[PDB]
């Protein structure tokens, strides 16, 4: 329909109109019945209690879609030209793009081939050149993604110090990355907006870290999500080594906004700070939640 | 689709053959003074091959030697283009050219 | 969702050419007088490596473009050429992608005319002259290196080895920057028969 | 535009097949490509098909098609988008009356080549002890013979055999008829399984009514300067073929005659035979068009 | 004639060319060929010399399948098609109903 | 659906060819003095070209 | 499909029987001057045999002698080309060559 | 149809058109619904992780073709007979080749009986003279290949150098045989392609391993395939022993390609060096990529 | 896709070195002499930089290589150096993996 557009940029950079408005122009179209699409994943966890069983948490799994495509054209020979692109399309070790646009915006999947595909009929394909291909695909990272939101601070002070507007509207805590110059002292914020995963939730309502010390060249990358090493340095030195066992622990909750203070100091050539806050959703669309 | 574009489309080549688009497979309406040309290119986007085609009043034929089209290889893209008398070129039929041989 | 889209930050690239085997190639694109104006010339006679020019079978005067184009404004090409004849062989700099505006330097060689010239093309095959013209002999073999440097607004040449420019302009009104990164080489001929060419090309970023 | 224009029916389109013939033919014998003579353009049946005889005039004859089909169904779109015709099954069945042999070898499914009739003719056909798997050739061919301009319509399955074989009752008041259905498969060597084709001076009258080829606009004729001899021998005589601008022979429908026939006598096939030299003029007339010819006569 | 034997047989026709005398053969194909057609079913009300034309525009239909044919010596041969009408993109619909 | 909203489509665009959009897509009753503009931008919202 | 491309087939060889592709089979339109050109190859390329035809107005025979067949093994290329008068070969058939005879 | 041709050459050189133009002329036809054919299996492996499980790596699966067959004539002694050569051509201990021919080339896969075959109806086949046969085999090298391209450079200089050109144009890597004559100091690429399973991936770029110097007589084989060992003399001497735990590490990884320098020094007779480069493919067709 | 990417292997490279940690780095991998066999002498006496060279605690010569290689065969090399005393100093380019072969 024309309220859902669904796209594949492959491995390779191929662009495909799976489904909605020029579905079918590259020759190959979706089929219904996709599983594990929409919804993210979780299972929840309970351990026993004087009433049954009590909840103990919630982890989030990775998508296994399974759906299938349909690859036609009129002669074999160009329908034979489409498969051998749409395979092409497609790789185990690197991830290829799947866009999902309505009028909630456009938000991507990062999926790979988790097996190897299942082709065509019981007889020959280019009896009809019109054939089935289930795809049996994994997400990895199982949330729906929209492009980050950026934002730039730049100082020439010796002492600064900012704020950054920031807020959650999706339903899935995200986590923040900054990209900090050197030299200089940041002091970055580590708010916890109420989360009591560590039973600290009002104690760091304002919680800051300060970064070791920069030296001269060594801007450095500070990613938040647990996937990454948190701090890397752009000149190869051991930040996070310097940094005497602390880390950045709280995700930005959804739902929750300030103006989050950056501090800088030491830094006399002044220096630049870029806070990304990344847009993760669970769904492909969904209204925006306040 | 507020805009048409061109029909994705298979060539045939083979070494020792004549390189022959059929009138009746490019069959249409074409003014005194209309144009075709058709274009090989690889993945880079470098020219392999530039033919013009006989424009008839209701047919366009295309003919080469095997000599001219020896070099164009297995899996190059093709263009075909129309240029109507006073208007700009339209592409008809995109695609591949396979290559219908005996390989060695 | 983006902020602002900003060019990548392409980095240096480099290219190479040598015209040994048949054909020229789908990497040099002919422009001027049209697709298969190009041809490789093996002059065997001189015992030499084949270089790149036209078909003289039916052409006289063909240009060439490099299919990628340069990532940076500043830019170093070096040439290995051949003199087996009379004639006018032009690396091309900061061409648009029909080689519409470019600079160039010109290697002329002739009974009288065997010299170097600075020169801002007018369409692939047309072109006009800046500045004086340098005296230079051109042996099989020799090397040219043509640089570009943006930041002076520069076209130079040095011959083989030394690092003095063997010809030198400025200021010469050629746009740059985005769609104007484009290299290629050009020849022209009285006669039929192949006079300065090319047997060996390199191309990179920066200078 | 009105109603009738636009509708442009003809009633000449109609086919009605007055009469009809089935032949049969071992697989073993070269199918028919066509069914029109090369010569004259009449009707020729390869060597090797036998007919079948009478059959039942109620039952009529009956070609059945079956397609087996799939609908592609969209993710985005409620009704199916494409469908797909996986293949198409062709029988025929008929009502066959006489009891000769090709007839009782296709329902029996055996070879009765080798039976030998008893001293008093008597004959007696077993039935195989397994059905044996037996592929024929056939010609379907109906005649509709109108204005004394037949249209021969004609159907072509070069690999046919026995699906079934209905039920068959004696009745004290009717004769004994066999009713089999023929499946037709896909021959290899002729890349079809039915053909459909049509051939007569009927035919040829609506070829361009139908739409095949082109319309008949120009009379052409053979080159107009044929040199035929007054004395008997071999140039006494000249044939004329009279074509159309859609390369269709229309020399049996067009009208030979001499404006001259003391130098060359012209028949009604095409033939000018020389009796007195000098020049003759032969027009060969069809409706509007005609074409003509200047024959020249020596002695 | 000839879009109505096309229809019925899945195949493209125009290259048919008829023999020296006017006969012509029609194989089916190797494979049925899926061709979509546009249909106009328009019909005609004749009341009082001001005629109703009610008409039915199909822009995309398929043939779906064929009945038996029976040959019978007093009457003419007819193809009785079913058409299935599919929605074309470019116009919107599968089915309108117009009159005029 | 108080409001009257834009329908989502997609345009195509072929490197040598002109580009087209037939009259005959975009129907509908337009008084004299009606003037149509398409605008081509990218992801930044920066716009990359507009026609009439 | 917009060029004009070969069929893929095969050829069945026998030993001690003489090749023949039948008229009835290559049939077609072909003016006089036509030739008909079958060529046989290995793996490498290495012309195994050259065989011409005998063209007629509407048919295309071939019949060669074991003799000349012998040196053809089972799995070898083949293709053959028809050339029209002023005109250059097409490639009507290619394929492979089969050998239908008891193996030794 | 004539788009696609399947061919069975048996371990005693049978061959059989089970599929496309000639099919059946030997008796035996290809049914529909054959499995694990087109994409060689590969599986995925996973570890947990911050947002369910990780991609960690692929392996690939030997292919498990279960398909099957028409053995048919009129007669039954002559169906006998077919269907005792359809046997024949098939063994456990060796391989019998399976050619698929498309517009896209020949490409074929050594396949053996993994059990007994199934053959006939429920009653005897004497009277159908017409059964079909299941056939269950198995593919070890799960990669449908071309003939290896080979290229010979000899010399009789005491010191030379080559430059062989090499291309890996399929999807998957493949890796290097060569054969060097004896005497002489051969010098062999080794080079990564950007492959960075040993963390080396630019480091290796141009890495040259040096063989150990051979005596007179000591031809060697050296395979990159990790199925073989990499070094083997043919006349049975330990010349692994004397090369110092250096070893050739790379497959040519699929898109890549260059002229790799083969240099050869102190063969007072000169030398002959025999490149074999394999073309292994996951499809039976597939478009040329790059 | 191959007009807009470009290649690793394509691309023109640029390393720097300065020493001026006191510490010979990942990116300078020692040949002949064995790994240890560099070392980083500071100069304090003199109102200079620190400069690479052989550890003399243990070895009179050593060589190093950079970690990576280049892209072209052309290649330009500055070099900022000092004079402490005798010696003799090697600028090395072309070489092999191994350092076996190599202008300088």
């Known amino acids: 329909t024309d309220f859902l557009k669904i796209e594949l940029i492959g491995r390779d950079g191929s662009h495909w109109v799976l489904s909605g408005p020029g579905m079918g122009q590259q020759g ?77 915006g456009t938000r991507f999947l990062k999926v790979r081939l988790m097996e190897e595909p299942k082709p065509y009929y019981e007889k020959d394909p280019h009896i009809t050149a019109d054939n089935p291909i289930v795809m049996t695909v994994t997400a990895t990272f199982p949330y729906w993604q929209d492009e980050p939101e950026e934002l730039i601070w730049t100082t020439l002070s010796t002492e600064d110090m900012t704020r950054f507007p920031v807020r959650n509207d999706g339903d899935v805590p995200v986590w923040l990355k900054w990209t900090l110059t050197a030299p200089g002292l940041w002091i970055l914020p580590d708010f916890s907006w109420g989360n009591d995963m560590y039973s600290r939730g009002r104690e760091d309502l304002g919680r800051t870290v300060a970064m070791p010390e920069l030296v001269a060249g060594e801007h450095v990358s500070v990613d938040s999500d647990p996937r990454v090493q948190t701090l890397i340095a752009v000149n190869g030195m051991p930040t996070q080594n310097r940094w005497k066992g602390n880390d950045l622990l709280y995700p930005l909750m959804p739902g929750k906004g300030a103006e989050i203070p950056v501090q800088l100091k030491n830094a006399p050539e002044g220096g630049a700070c870029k806070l990304t806050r990344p847009r993760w959703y669970s769904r492909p669309w969904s209204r925006p939640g306040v | 689709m507020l805009s048409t574009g061109p029909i994705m489309e298979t060539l045939t080549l083979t070494v020792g053959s004549a390189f022959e688009i059929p009138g009746w497979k490019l069959r249409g309406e074409y003014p005194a003074g209309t144009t075709s040309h058709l274009v090989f290119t690889d993945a880079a986007g470098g020219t392999l091959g530039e033919f013009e085609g006989t424009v008839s009043a209701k047919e366009i034929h295309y003919l080469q030697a095997p000599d001219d089209v020896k070099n164009i290889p297995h899996g190059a893209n093709f263009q075909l283009f129309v240029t109507y008398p006073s208007m700009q070129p339209q592409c008809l039929y995109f695609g591949t050219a396979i290559r219908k041989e005996p390989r060695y | 969702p983006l902020s602002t889209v900003v060019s990548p930050e392409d980095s240096a690239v480099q290219y190479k050419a040598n015209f040994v085997g048949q054909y020229i190639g789908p990497m040099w694109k002919p422009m001027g007088n049209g697709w298969g104006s190009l041809g490789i010339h093996t002059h065997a006679l001189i015992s030499e490596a084949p270089s790149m020019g036209p078909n003289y079978s039916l052409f006289s005067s063909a240009a060439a473009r490099w299919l990628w184009s340069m990532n940076m404004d500043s830019v170093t090409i070096v040439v290995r050429v051949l ?9 091309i700099v900061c061409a648009d992608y029909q080689m519409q505006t470019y600079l160039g330097i010109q290697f002329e060689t002739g009974i009288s005319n065997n010299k170097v010239h600075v020169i801002t093309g007018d369409g692939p095959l047309n072109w006009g002259y ?21 930041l002076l607004d520069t076209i130079s040449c040095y011959k083989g080895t030394s690092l003095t420019p063997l010809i030198e302009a400025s200021g ?17 001929t009285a006669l039929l028969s192949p006079g300065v060419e090319p047997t060996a090309w390199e191309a990179k970023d920066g200078v | 535009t009105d109603f009738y224009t636009i509708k442009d029916a003809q009633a000449d389109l109609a086919i009605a097949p007055l009469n009809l013939t089935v032949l049969l033919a071992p697989y073993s014998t070269t199918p028919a490509t066509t069914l029109e003579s090369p010569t004259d353009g009449s009707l020729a049946i390869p060597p090797g098909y036998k007919s079948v005889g009478h059959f039942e005039k109620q039952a009529g004859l009956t070609l059945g098609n079956e397609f087996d089909s799939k609908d592609i169904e969209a993710y985005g779109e409620p009704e199916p988008i494409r469908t797909i015709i996986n293949k198409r099954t062709t029988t025929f069945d008929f009502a066959m009356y006489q009891n000769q042999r090709n007839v009782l070898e296709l329902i029996w499914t055996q070879d009765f080549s080798n039976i030998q009739p008893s001293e008093f003719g008597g004959i007696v056909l077993e ?54 259905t023929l499946k037709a498969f896909r021959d290899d060597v002729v890349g079809y399984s039915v053909a459909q084709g049509f051939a007569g001076p009927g035919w040829r009258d609506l070829v361009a009514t139908a739409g095949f080829g082109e319309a008949l606009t120009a009379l052409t004729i053979t080159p107009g300067s044929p040199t035929v001899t007054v004395a008997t021998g071999a140039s006494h005589t000249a044939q004329l073929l009279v074509e159309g601008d859609n390369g269709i022979n229309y020399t049996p429908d067009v009208v030979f005659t001499s404006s001259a026939p003391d130098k060359a006598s012209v028949s009604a096939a095409g033939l000018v035979t020389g009796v007195a030299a000098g020049s003759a003029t032969i027009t060969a007339t069809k409706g509007a068009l005609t074409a003509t010819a200047t024959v020249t006569v020596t002695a």
Chains 1, 8 share one sequence.
Do not use: C
């Open chain 1, 28 to 104: 190959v179209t979706l089929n219904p019945n996709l599983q594990q699409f929409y919804d993210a994943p979780v299972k929840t966890l309970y351990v026993p209690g004087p009433f049954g069983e009590e909840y103990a948490g919630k982890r989030v799994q990775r998508r296994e879609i399974v759906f299938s495509v349909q690859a036609y054209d009129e002669d074999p020979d160009t329908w034979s030209t489409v498969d051998s692109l749409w395979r092409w399309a497609w790789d185990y070790d690197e991830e290829s793009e799947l866009r999902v646009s309505t009028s909630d």
């Open chain 3, 130 to 150: 800046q500045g004086d013209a340098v005296n230079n002999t051109t042996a099989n073999g020799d090397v040219y290196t043509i640089k570009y440097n943006d």
């Open chain 4, 127 to 180: 039935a195989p002890k397994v059905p044996k798997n037996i592929y024929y050739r056939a010609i379907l061919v109906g005649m509709d013979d109108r204005n004394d301009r037949p249209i021969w319509l004609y159907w072509l399955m070069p690999k046919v055999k026995l699906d079934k074989l209905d039920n068959q009752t004696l009745n004290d008041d009717n004769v004994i008829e066999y009713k089999p």
């Open chain 3, 172 to 188: 010469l009104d050629v746009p740059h920057g985005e769609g104007f990164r484009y290299t290629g080489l050009a020849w022209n």
């Open chain 3, 83 to 91: 003199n087996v004849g009379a004639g006018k062989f032009n690396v």
